[PDB]
Amino acid sequence: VKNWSIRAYGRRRQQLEYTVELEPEEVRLLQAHNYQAYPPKNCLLLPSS
Amino acid sequence: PRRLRVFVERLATALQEANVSAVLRWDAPEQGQEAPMQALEYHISCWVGSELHEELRLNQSALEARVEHLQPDQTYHFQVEARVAATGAAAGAASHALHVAPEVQAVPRVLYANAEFIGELDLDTRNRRRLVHTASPVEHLVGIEGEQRLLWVNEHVELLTHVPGSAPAKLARMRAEVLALAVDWIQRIVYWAELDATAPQAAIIYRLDLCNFEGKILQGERVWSTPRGRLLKDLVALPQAQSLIWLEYEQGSPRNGSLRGRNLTDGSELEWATVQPLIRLHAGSLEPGSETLNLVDNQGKLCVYDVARQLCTASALRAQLNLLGEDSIAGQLAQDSGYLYAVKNWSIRAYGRRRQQLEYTVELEPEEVRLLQAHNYQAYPPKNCLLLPSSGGSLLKATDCEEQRCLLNLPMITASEDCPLPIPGVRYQLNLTLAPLGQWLLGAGESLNLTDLLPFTRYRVSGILSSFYQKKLALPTLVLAPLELLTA
Amino acid sequence: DAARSWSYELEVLDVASQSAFSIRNIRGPIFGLQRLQPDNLYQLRVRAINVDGEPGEWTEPLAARTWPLGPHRLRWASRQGSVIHTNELGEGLEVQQEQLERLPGPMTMVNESVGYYVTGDGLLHCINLVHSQWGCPISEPLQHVGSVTYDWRGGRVYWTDLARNCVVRMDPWSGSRELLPVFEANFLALDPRQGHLYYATSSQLSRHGSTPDEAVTYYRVGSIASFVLDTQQDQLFWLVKGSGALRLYRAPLTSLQMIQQIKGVFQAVPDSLQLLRPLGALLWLERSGRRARLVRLAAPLDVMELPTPDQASPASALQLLDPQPLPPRDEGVIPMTVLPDSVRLDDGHWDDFHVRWQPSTSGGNHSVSYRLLLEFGQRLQTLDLSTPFARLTQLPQAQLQLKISITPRTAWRSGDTTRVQLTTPPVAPSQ
Amino acid sequence: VDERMVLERVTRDCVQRCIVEEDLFLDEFGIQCEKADNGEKCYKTRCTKGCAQWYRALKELESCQEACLSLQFYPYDMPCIGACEMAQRDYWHLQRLAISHLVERTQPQLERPLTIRWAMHFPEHYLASRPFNIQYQFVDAWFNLADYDCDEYYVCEILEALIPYTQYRFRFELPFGENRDEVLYSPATPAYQTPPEGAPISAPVIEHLMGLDDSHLAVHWHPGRFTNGPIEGYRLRLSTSEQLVPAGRGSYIFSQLQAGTNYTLALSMI
Ligand SMILES: *[C@@H]1O[C@H](CO[C@@H]2O[C@@H](C)[C@@H](O)[C@@H](O)[C@@H]2O)[C@@H](O[C@@H]2O[C@H](CO)[C@@H](O)[C@H](O)[C@H]2NC(C)=O)[C@H](O)[C@H]1NC(C)=O
Ligand SMILES: *[C@@H]1O[C@H](CO)[C@@H](O[C@@H]2O[C@H](CO)[C@@H](O)[C@H](O)[C@H]2NC(C)=O)[C@H](O)[C@H]1NC(C)=O
Ligand SMILES: *[C@@H]1O[C@H](CO)[C@@H](O)[C@H](O)[C@H]1NC(C)=O
Ligand SMILES: *[C@@H]1O[C@H](CO)[C@@H](O)[C@H](O)[C@H]1NC(C)=O
Ligand SMILES: *[C@@H]1O[C@H](CO)[C@@H](O)[C@H](O)[C@H]1NC(C)=O
Ligand SMILES: *[C@@H]1O[C@H](CO)[C@@H](O)[C@H](O)[C@H]1NC(C)=O
Ligand SMILES: *[C@@H]1O[C@H](CO)[C@@H](O)[C@H](O)[C@H]1NC(C)=O
Ligand SMILES: *[C@@H]1O[C@H](CO)[C@@H](O)[C@H](O)[C@H]1NC(C)=O
């Protein structure tokens, strides 16, 4: 967030992709949907032995 | 005018839920010879009360449909309308309401086996198939309908199998005359009986496990034998009662048929009380808790036997089948979940189990039917019971040891307390260690007796437990408890 | 002509004190026992003394538990339209001055004068009980109405329109009706804490909320006869009228289990289930109208039977009247009107062309969502928003007069529409 | 020619209702159109779209939510859905009032598989309706028959295994659309008795079972409901004494039993 605008920088192409202007009190916190990689179903569940 | 014919078909595959579908068949209306064969649009709407279950539109010359995912003990109404596809003109309409009730309803299909082939005869459409062309003629025939496997014995006395899409593979070659044949469908064990040519004659019950079949010819194992002077006929395996019921007659008296058998877990001899001596025995309902035998007395009288009550059960099909004569109901008698089939005067007569009436009579060529096998409902255990268990436990019990050897006992495994039946195709893989010294891949039921041990020295066995369905599903192998066995 | 002139024995076994109290010499099989402690459980058995003094055997004890103490009044309705207020025995009859129509159902009360009831032909009627010259906003009765309910917090009357397969929400003070997207419903109850509308079809019982995430289906089948909603204990009862078996259930509002299945050819009136609050008991009237059946939630096996009074000999509705008054209309759920001077069309750079306004609030701080309507001449664009923000995608570039209609709403009701006309800015790039 | 009058009458009443109630409902966007716009925001254009789309949804088995699907008012266009559902229930009400006398005057006939021949025909929109139920009743409520197979001229065929030696009456329930209150009932058949077959499935219920003195024991009983045949005898086992009593007698008294002790009676039906 710089000067009431949120700037998305792409990880693949390494460039600025989106700049979206804001109202001055819209963003106090910023959280992203980062990829929460889960274990497989043998690891999450009950063990066999 | 032809009517709409709907049949409830229940098909159970092991490690899968039993699915119920309605086979909707309706012939075309009568068309003239000037017009060609017309496409008919069949609109089928299936209702459960006031809600729509499935809606099907099919372009067919004659109707042959399947409405899947029916539920048992529920009333389904099938509203079928037929329209001509090119013009939109109404050809016909039918409304079939149907309680599902899948223990008394099936599609009327038999398996017949002449000297040339084994085929399917649908008694509804009167159409004949060929499943397998046999080089040598079939003498006995059983089947596993969950995997469409036909197990049969030829004139050249050899046991063969047939999955669809493959060649017939020989499972065993047999050195004596085979009296009977049966299959445990859950544990995949094929039981047969062979004649003994010793002057007191007996019948030796052999078995062969189909989970050990990897493409080469196996050999049978002697598990039980007959008391001398007596012989077998008509082997029927009941897995849910764990029984192997035959008809034990005496040599020289074939109309003294007495119902005997063995329990399939511990090998104990079981006895069934009949009020009259028998001649032939046929299997019945094959349903857990309600298992049935169609046994024939020496007067040519059918009794619809009950296995659990050990008594005759009065039915309305018993009086109608006794009017056919002794040569019809002791010739060939087959019974699926829905119908009960008999051959009289070159015609196969299906007797329905629900309405207790004669339903289909299909005329035959005089050498079409030598054997008759129905697709009886082979009820499978649930997926917890068929597969590998969760807990390992102390399954190997330590026996009393001598100084030279210790007889380790290898028992059968139920998966929990909720599973009454054994797990199919159990193979232990073991090593022995001095608390490797040996490597054995040995199944369940036998014993490993463990020679060449040092005196006054402790030894340790360890094992994994492998079953048939955990190798098919690629499920991971249970490691059981490594127990230590002391020698004195 | 054989004579059995006997004198009966009725014992009272209190379970709280372990005390056996027995009286003698009653002549008839009927007996009106008096002077019990309220909120108490008793066990009752009967034997019979002859002339010689030899009694009969004891029967099985019946789990007999008292109504709690209070002025606990039952409102009976006839099939001819007479209203009789009794207490919980069927005694103490007071004939009310109001005259309902033929075959009335349950009367849903808005304030202490105006009530709404649904008759047997599907018509919905309004009655002012105190002063009948004024109080009803709808002049004529309304056909094809399944049931009726009232929200005290929103101040809205909800009924199922069976002709439209919709639920109609109505202001009782003005008669302004709103179509709600709730389909094929027969009976209604709304939770005032959160604004969720609970509804039961012939096949299913489910929930409608302010968002589509809040729709939870509780049951799917005979047919559902009636249902009630327990707001305090967070649970939900319904009656399924099947093939000769009237069966009652319970689910929480977030274990689905069977309480009592009543077998017989007699069944219940649709919209006759009621939750009796001080016992935690469930009442339903029977179809013949001479019997009301009651089950306790603590003891499911005991099904009590309430006979109907003789002055209203066929009954079509029975309510336990609430002893507290109904609470008034909350001004904390009313959304405030969006200010028309604050509706700007302040645009950003590139393709960000958007409309912002000052956000509407309520008294108690509830979620205010918005419905916006656009008019680009003949072009229409309707957006359902949850923020004071609406991006305009199809801008026609040629300096139009855009008509914007913001309607704030909450989970209970809706606010007034703010209608503005704004001049669009000049759009130079078109790409 | 009657069907197109029913179509045009329901379409006339639908367009007349959408003219009438255009001011009655408050919309969620706050529309409030005047009486002469003919614009797409108003109640009258969406409501006459609902009266345009009601018949095409009925004969092609579409819902009124799926027929009245627009990209402006999403997910639900409520005047369009409401006008479609009101016109469909007005149509099924007019078909029920058209064919009500012909349903209630025509009696079904039983012949003997067991066959009901009703002198009617399937409706024109047969798949749009609910399925008709044949209903059965014991002669000595109406329950739905589970197994039958009918064609379009109502020549039915009962495949349900009925109880033997039981008098039965049959009738047709005709639902009309999804409205559960709009059902028509045919008159009942002449009463047909099933042919007798099999053992009885109902035990005979005793009426009064007491002792007479210390050396006799009396019982009175009535026959059961499904006796499955002509009744011949009732066997009484007292525990043992086992007696044969014919079909005319419903009261038997035992003798030569022990004084002052506890017995058990077993009653069967032959
Ligand atoms: C079932 O068939 C109809 C009619 O089939 C047409 O006529 C036959 C004689 C043959 O020539 C077919 O190939 C023709 O299609 C189908 O109705 C047609 O559907 C298509 C696709 O929607 C449409 O373009 C055509 O106008 C329709 N034609 C007519 C004459 O009605 C119908 O869709 C088929 N139904 C199903 C479920 O496959
Ligand atoms: C209960 O509410 C109703 C409105 O729902 C009130 O009825 C109004 O009463 C006034 C005064 O008599 C009339 O001028 C209005 O015309 C009525 N409104 C309508 C819409 O008809 C009623 O007074 C309220 N009762 C009490 C006791 O507060
Ligand atoms: C930073 O924001 C202000 C907000 O008023 C704006 O005027 C200014 O142009 C912005 N600066 C840049 C470099 O974009
Ligand atoms: C029903 O079961 C059969 C046999 O297991 C299988 O071939 C088929 O795919 C199943 N059909 C379903 C689940 O629709
Ligand atoms: C039939 O066999 C039974 C059992 O072995 C025996 O008791 C009986 O004598 C036999 N009957 C005849 C006629 O041989
Ligand atoms: C076979 O043996 C098992 C295990 O001992 C027992 O549970 C079962 O009842 C036996 N089966 C029969 C049919 O007796
Ligand atoms: C039995 O079969 C023969 C075959 O030629 C036929 O002529 C005869 O009619 C049949 N008998 C009966 C009773 O159907
Ligand atoms: C294995 O030991 C057992 C102990 O009972 C004995 O019966 C058997 O002969 C032994 N087998 C071999 C192959 O040595």
Ligand SMILES: *[C@@H]1O[C@H](CO)[C@@H](O)[C@H](O)[C@H]1NC(C)=O
């Ligand atoms: C036995 O030992 C061999 C050699 O280490 C190993 O491959 C095998 O997995 C072991 N099996 C068990 C059951 O421990």
Ligand SMILES: *[C@@H]1O[C@H](CO)[C@@H](O)[C@H](O)[C@H]1NC(C)=O
């Ligand atoms: C609502 O919000 C206002 C302003 O944030 C605050 O003063 C007030 O306490 C809140 N609650 C209620 C119940 O009004």
